[PDB]
C-alpha cells in the first residue's frame, strides 16, 4: 500500500501477429489503482497501419487498476513489487482465435507491461480483418481461484458498423510471482472505451473503468 500509490504510471510493449501480419506497439498510461480508472496512449511502431480491427488488441493493454472493496482480497495489487503474469484465450464466434501472454512488474515506481499476442484463423471476410468493429460493450468478468491462481471468464461482445454484434469468450489465468492471498469468487464490471484515434489507428487512446463487486450479479 506504500508500493501501489494512489496515482501510478505504466509503460507497455506488445509484440504480435494477426493472420500472420507482424507488428509492435509501444505505449504509456496512467491512472488511479484504488479508484479503478486508467488511460493509455498507444503507438504502432512496426507493422503499421494494422490491417485488422484495433478492438482485438485493446483489452490487452492492466488489472492492478481494479477498484476492490475491503472484503475482497486484491491479489494482483498484493503481488507487487514482483508482479504477476497472465495468459488469455479469446475465441470468437466465427472461428478467430487470439492467445496472449503478459508479464507485469514494477520498476522505478512505474508498472512495466510486456505483451505477446497471436491472432489466427480470422476469416478474410469477417469484421476483424475488414475493420468493421466499433468497440466492446460493457462486460463482467467472473473471477474464481483455482490451482493456486486467479482465473476469470467472460462473454464479450463487439458492436459492428452494420448495427449487429460479434461475440467472443475470454478465459484468463492470472498468477502472482509470489504466493499472496487469493480472493473467493466475485465479479469485475468493466467498461473499456477508445477515446480517440487517428485515421489509420496508428495512434490510439483508451480509457478503462473496472470495479469488483460480490456475485449475484446486479
Amino acid at each position: 500500500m506504500a508500493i501501489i500509490k494512489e496515482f501510478m504510471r505504466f509503460k507497455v510493449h506488445m509484440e504480435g501477429s494477426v493472420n500472420g501480419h507482424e507488428f509492435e506497439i509501444e505505449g504509456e498510461g496512467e491512472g488511479r489503482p484504488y479508484e479503478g480508472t486508467q488511460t493509455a496512449k498507444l503507438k504502432v511502431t512496426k507493422g503499421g497501419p494494422l490491417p485488422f480491427a484495433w478492438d482485438i488488441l485493446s483489452p490487452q493493454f492492466s488489472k492492478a487498476y481494479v477498484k476492490h472493496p475491503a472484503d475482497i482480497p486484491d491479489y494482483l495489487k498484493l503481488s507487487f513489487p514482483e508482479g504477476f503474469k497472465w495468459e488469455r484465450v479469446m475465441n470468437f464466434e466465427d472461428g478467430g482465435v487470439v492467445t496472449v501472454t503478459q508479464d507485469s512488474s514494477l520498476q522505478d515506481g512505474e508498472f512495466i507491461y510486456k505483451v505477446k499476442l497471436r491472432g489466427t484463423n480470422f476469416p478474410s471476410d469477417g469484421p476483424v480483418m475488414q475493420k468493421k468493429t466499433m468497440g466492446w460493450v460493457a462486460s463482467s468478468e467472473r473471477m474464481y481461484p483455482e490451482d493456486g491462481a486467479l482465473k476469470g471468464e467472460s462473454k464479450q461482445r463487439l458492436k459492428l458498423k452494420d448495427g449487429g454484434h460479434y461475440d467472443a469468450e475470454f478465459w484468463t489465468t492470472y498468477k502472482a510471482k509470489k504466493p499472496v492471498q487469493l480472493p473467493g469468487a466475485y465479479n469485475v464490471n468493466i467498461k473499456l472505451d477508445i477515446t480517440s484515434h487517428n485515421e489509420d489507428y496508428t495512434i490510439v487512446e483508451q480509457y478503462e473503468r473496472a470495479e469488483g463487486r460480490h456475485s449475484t450479479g446486479g
Side-chain angles (χ1 to χ4, degrees), residues 2-160 162-215 217-218:
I3 312 92
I4 309 303
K5 306 184 168 330
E6 289 191 53
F7 174 79
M8 296 283 281
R9 302 188 174 278
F10 64 88
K11 295 204 194 131
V12 58
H13 160 76
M14 171 187 285
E15 273 159 17
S17 81
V18 175
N19 273 23
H21 178 97
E22 301 208 322
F23 63 94
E24 290 181 24
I25 284 168
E26 305 279 341
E28 305 89 50
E30 65 192 70
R32 288 144 178 88
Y34 302 91
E35 308 173 13
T37 57
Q38 60 184 125
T39 52
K41 301 183 177 139
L42 299 317
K43 301 189 167 66
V44 175
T45 56
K46 306 193 183 150
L50 310 169
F52 54 83
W54 183 266
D55 290 322
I56 65 173
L57 310 179
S58 62
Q60 331 310 333
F61 297 118
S62 50
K63 306 211 118 112
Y65 295 82
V66 180
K67 181 180 186 184
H68 282 76
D71 67 324
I72 297 172
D74 199 336
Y75 173 77
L76 297 181
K77 287 193 182 59
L78 291 165
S79 79
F80 285 95
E82 294 85 346
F84 66 99
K85 298 175 171 290
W86 59 263
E87 306 182 357
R88 173 173 291 170
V89 166
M90 293 150 63
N91 281 336
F92 288 84
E93 66 173 290
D94 62 353
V97 169
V98 178
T99 58
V100 190
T101 60
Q102 197 266 18
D103 180 88
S104 299
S105 58
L106 175 65
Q107 286 168 245
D108 288 326
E110 312 199 349
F111 297 118
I112 302 298
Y113 298 159
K114 297 287 181 186
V115 190
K116 299 199 194 73
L117 179 144
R118 191 196 65 239
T120 54
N121 202 43
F122 283 99
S124 64
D125 58 283
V128 172
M129 301 306 295
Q130 292 302 326
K131 293 172 56 181
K132 297 172 166 157
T133 64
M134 294 192 90
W136 300 93
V137 172
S139 58
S140 173
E141 188 184 18
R142 276 103 153 79
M143 313 301 300
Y144 63 100
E146 184 170 55
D147 294 334
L150 180 59
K151 300 210 180 165
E153 290 168 0
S154 70
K155 310 299 208 52
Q156 298 270 334
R157 165 169 285 188
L158 281 161
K159 295 173 275 174
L160 296 184
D162 63 18
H165 57 268
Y166 173 57
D167 293 350
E169 299 180 82
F170 287 28
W171 293 268
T172 312
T173 298
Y174 310 88
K175 181 51 172 292
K177 284 158 177 171
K178 68 196 170 176
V180 288
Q181 181 191 14
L182 287 159
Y186 70 108
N187 300 311
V188 172
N189 296 318
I190 298 152
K191 184 45 160 30
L192 169 53
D193 297 326
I194 298 309
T195 54
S196 65
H197 59 88
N198 67 1
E199 187 224 69
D200 61 5
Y201 284 82
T202 52
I203 304 295
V204 183
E205 304 198 358
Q206 308 184 178
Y207 167 87
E208 184 178 283
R209 176 173 192 293
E211 175 177 2
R213 288 196 166 145
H214 284 295
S215 201

